[PDB]
Structures are given as C-alpha cells and as structure tokens.
Amino acid sequence: LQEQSELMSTVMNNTPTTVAALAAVAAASETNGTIPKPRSSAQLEQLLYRYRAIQNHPKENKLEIKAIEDTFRNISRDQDIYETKLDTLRKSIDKGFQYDEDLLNKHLVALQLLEKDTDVPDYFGDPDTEIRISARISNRINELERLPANLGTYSLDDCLEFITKDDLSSRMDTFKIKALVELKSLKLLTKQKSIRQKLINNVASQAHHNIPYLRDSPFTAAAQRSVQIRSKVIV
Amino acid sequence: GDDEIENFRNGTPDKLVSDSLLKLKRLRKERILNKVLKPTTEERELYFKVKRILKEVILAKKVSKVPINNVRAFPVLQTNYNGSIPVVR
Amino acid sequence: YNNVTLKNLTAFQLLSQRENICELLNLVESTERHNSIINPERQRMSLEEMKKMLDALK
C-alpha cells in the first residue's frame, strides 16, 4: 500500500513521531508485500534517513529498524564496490583509441532522444493498433496539463538588453506559447479530421471532371455519355 | 556497480554502447506495443550503464570535438500576483 | 465480383494488352494455356466419338 509513499506523506504532514506506522508484523509487513530497496536517487533515501533519525527516541517500539540498517549496510557495501570498480576502471583504459567524431554525434543525439520518449530513426484500420495510438496522445495531454502556468524562459540573449529591477524583457514567453501550441493542437485533432473529410469527399467525389487523364479515357467518357440518354418517346 | 565495463574497457569502448541503444529501442517498441507507461527496472538499470560509459571517455580520452548544441534557454518559474482592483458582484 | 469498375476494366485491358506484347519477345512461356486447351488426347477422343457416331448413324 505504498509504504515508500506513506513515509513521504508522514514527512510532508510534519507528524511522523505521532504515528510511526505502527511497526509490528500486522502493519509494517503488510505494506512491504526486509524493505524493498528504494529506487530513487535520494528522494526515497532521505526519507529513510529522517525516519531513522526520528525513531532514535523510542528505539524499542519499532522492530523494523534492523532491516533498514541492513539496507544501509547494503548501500554502503555497493558504494564501496563501485568506488573500487571506478578506481580500477580508470586504470583499465587503453592509451590510444581516437574515438570517432561522427559516431559520437549519433550516440549523443540517440541517447538524448531516448531519454525523453520520442522516436529515433535508425541510421545505424485494425482497431487493436488504433487504441495504442489514441493512448499515447492522452499521455501527452495529461503530461502537458501538469506544467505550471507560471513557466518562463531565460535565454542567453537577455544580457544585451540590460534588464533593471522592473523592466519586462521581451523573450520571456518563448516556451509557454510553445507549450500551448502543442496542448491546443492535440485538442483540435478531430476538427481537422472533419475538415479533411469535407475536403477529400469533395475533391475525390468528382474525380472525372477535373483530372484530365481520367475524363479522356474511353470507358469514363462512355459511361458519362450513356447516363445522359433521354428515354425513348413511344409514338 | 560496473561488473562488465572493466572487462570491455580493455578493448574498444563503443560496441557495447550501440548494442545497448538497440536494446533500448527494442524495449521502447515493446513498451509502446503493450500499453505500459512506467519504464521497466531492466532498462532503467540499463540506461545509466550507457550514460556512465559516455561520461568516462570524456573523463579519459578528451575527444577532439565533443560538440556543443544547446537551445540557449531553459525554463524557470516566474512570480505571480493577483490583480489589485477588487471584484465586482 | 458480380459487377465491374473502371479499375477492373482498365486492369483487364492492360493485362491482356501486356500479355500480347510478351509473345513477340518470347519472355513468357504460355505453354500451359496452350496445351490445356488443345489437349491432343482429348482431340483424338472427341474424333473417336465422332467416328462412333458415324458408325451408329450408318
């Protein structure tokens, strides 16, 4: 039940000693399914730091201190292993390789595009695959709609304008317009679809009076000629 | 840790990078075609392992260009404030 | 498949027009469409039927 978010909620509510998660087998082990080895850089580790620093006062009501300290031992051991491996890795380098430039370009651009979830070109119907497109657009809409409205730039070209304490520079909004062109272009999609239908179903709906090589064929001219035959008058 | 980069640093550094980026691209296709949103713990672990290697050459070799291309801006928050004229009902 | 279109008529005429030019250059065989319709054993079997009709009618 997200104990690694329950610690964050108890920290941000500023009352963590008053509850202390009721560390028994019935409560502290029901959310764990040891502790699950936190994932973040420090956002789930500083919480463990503060949690141990608050639980130094009771020291016996909470039996889960030992598994947390075992994970501190694991973190210290992994850190010492990485420091020894970084000491050896800087000694295992060849004296000459002369890494190529125009492949370093491609690795940097490819890593940068693979960070922020966009498609990388290689250079090295069916409503199953219709929903898998219409579920990537809701991703982008509900990711752009969580940006703060007070978003603003600071380009490297405001130094040539000498902005005072209150001067209102003229390149402050080169990202918030761009973060609304996407968010409103991804909501006007089923309007340009309905305009493209009215375009194609009135250009292709003639198809034999505008295109020259179709209205000059034998069979099209014969069909258009034969539909215009006025019915025979008996007597 | 590293556990492989010591062994592969003895030869060329660059083959593992492309052989890992192709795996990232295949895993990204397999995440798109599965309606999953969070990345797995198998490519995240495989992501930093890429970014380490490209760091170390820049630490070690000092490759002749290491090109610089930036958008020359970055987003910052700016102060907001309500209007001072009161509301009319 | 009961009806014809402009695409069907154009494809039929283009196919039948390119099959006729490929017999001058002899880059297509077309021996199967020949011999499945000639079929000389069927021809002599039919001639034997005509001969038996001559015998039965005389």
């Binding site: 651009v109 | 291309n69 930036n70 | -």
Partner: peptide
C-alpha cells in the same frame, strides 16, 4: 542531459539483358 536544438535533430537525420538479347534477335 541538456536538450539539443530542433534544427540540429532535423539536420543530422539482371532484368536488363532479358529484353536486349530478345530485341537483337527479333
């Protein structure tokens, strides 16, 4: 982990003789 310019991503990214041999003959 600095983003790259968009205008740089957009910047880095036997059938012959079978007729002749039949056209020479006929």
């Amino acid at each position: 982990s600095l983003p790259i310019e968009d205008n740089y991503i957009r910047e880095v990214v036997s059938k012959l003789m079978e007729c002749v041999n039949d056209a020479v003959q006929t």
